[PDB]
Symmetry: D3
Subunit: 117 residues, 6 copies
């Protein structure tokens, strides 16, 4: 089975980077529905897992994540990063969970293609 891992570093709404990331993932999912795709969000991107994002503009990062964690795409947030920005205890989007660098390593060594945004 093809195993893809996308790791995002960009902060939500400030970097078009995080936005493109979730767009690729959502796209990759449809093309090859049977694809083992996982997501690890580092540094700034970690705040993306917060509930209640109410964008007035256009795209909604919470919505894009829910589209993924509804089709069963693992979405993890770096522990040290969420702990520093105080998001570990706050309400996170559904299929979004806290993860570690070690698991991220595991995914990396196990993946066939690792894309970094």
């Amino acid at each position: 089975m093809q195993k893809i891992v996308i790791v995002a570093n960009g902060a939500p709404y400030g970097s078009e980077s995080l936005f493109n990331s979730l767009r690729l993932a959502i796209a990759l999912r449809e093309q090859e529905s049977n694809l083992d795709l996982r997501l690890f969000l580092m540094s700034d991107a970690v705040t993306a897992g917060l509930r209640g994002q109410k964008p007035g503009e256009g795209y909604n990062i919470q919505q894009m994540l829910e589209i993924l964690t509804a089709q069963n795409v693992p979405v993890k947030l770096c522990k040290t990063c969420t702990d520093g920005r105080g998001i570990s205890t706050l309400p996170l989007i559904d299929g979004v969970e806290i993860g570690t660098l070690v698991e991220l390593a595991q995914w990396t060594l196990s993946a066939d293609k690792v894309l970094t945004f």
Copy 2:
């Protein structure tokens, strides 16, 4: 007297940027006890107002904000930026609050200096 406005745009911990502005601001206030100094956090930097910050390394953005909002230094988080990332309702640092673009234009115009970090 002297009216100085500081505008941070960068995400907490992601880069030294927000850290420098807060670092400069504390330095300004420690050089002039009654300097009318106001902080305004936009875009990515709006997440710094979060309360549960617990880094475990070097600098603590929450702590730096508390050193500023205790010397009665206003610190505003841009309403739309907070509404976008779901921060408008969560617990924010002590004297940290939610302001509007109208307020920053209001500040800017009546200010002697406007350091835009």
Copy 3:
């Protein structure tokens, strides 16, 4: 009145950087319609002056620039940056125009505040 000069450096849509500089720009002129407010675009921001901008969603940088040039807010694109990107000869947003660094070093020397984004 009061001379204020805004200087954007970020690429359009790539980051809130140039978007915020325009929101702040438009907002300043609403508080005071007399403001001798001037806009200068450097490097990557230079492409914002192009015509034909039709954003899939979210904000539209062209309109914002048009809403400024309509009030007569001088918007100048740096000559060197435009040449290297091939924006000089192409159709510009309106009462956008190609300016120079020598012009910036002047607005700066005669301004009251220089808001740098």
Copy 4:
């Protein structure tokens, strides 16, 4: 053989990332004359496709793309991105073309490697 996809988010000249992507791209080909190389440009790196780039300074992104397109290395510009910047209807450098996320999300699935700069 081998399929290598290269993605780029960086704005020409303002950043270094885009320049590096192309330098590495031209290098990969020089190593393997037959290397199946595909270049996708998202967000900001999309203005890099404009014709008439003539910087009096250092590198010339236009030339680096012609070096790659002369070899028939496909270079696709993201549709949604180009539309937002009003570059869709402008004259693009030869081999440069307007592609879609759907395509990137396909090249990715059928590639041994994907470098994302």
Copy 5:
């Protein structure tokens, strides 16, 4: 045996980029000792090879680079980047040498995965 190349571009301490890049490399090495792991630094990352870093804060990039070269991991700094920055002839960390984009093209061609933080 696995061939994994990690490329980094972010200046040290300035962003988390280069930091999480080395952190992930150290964790990958701790996972599988017999992993063919290569480190290549371009642009601003090139200055991380400098000896004598004395950060009084938290993470120390020099120590992270030494922990890697200790486990016999190659670490080459881009030659053209180092020349223009004045680093090509300064004291470098223990196992850090100057490399070439030609060497990076070789690495990427024979690598199973190429991570680009």
Copy 6:
């Protein structure tokens, strides 16, 4: 006398940011031969003070710094930033010296305008 301060954050060569700071400072230094212009470099911009920068490309940041120092323009490198990179003990440029935050707070306090890139 007009007192202007330029605070730079960008890494040399990795971005145009630092470049424009120096260029706009040299511009300011020529139009007003009798102005008090001061330069402070924080973060990644700090390594711009090293000697021996021989870029084979375009602009040479060492030269731009010499043209300013030659004109008695104070160039200070943040002390803690230079400690972390190990530049505090390395050979610095002609008139480039190591400075502190406290000093910057003072420059900002006695300045008419402060430009930050």
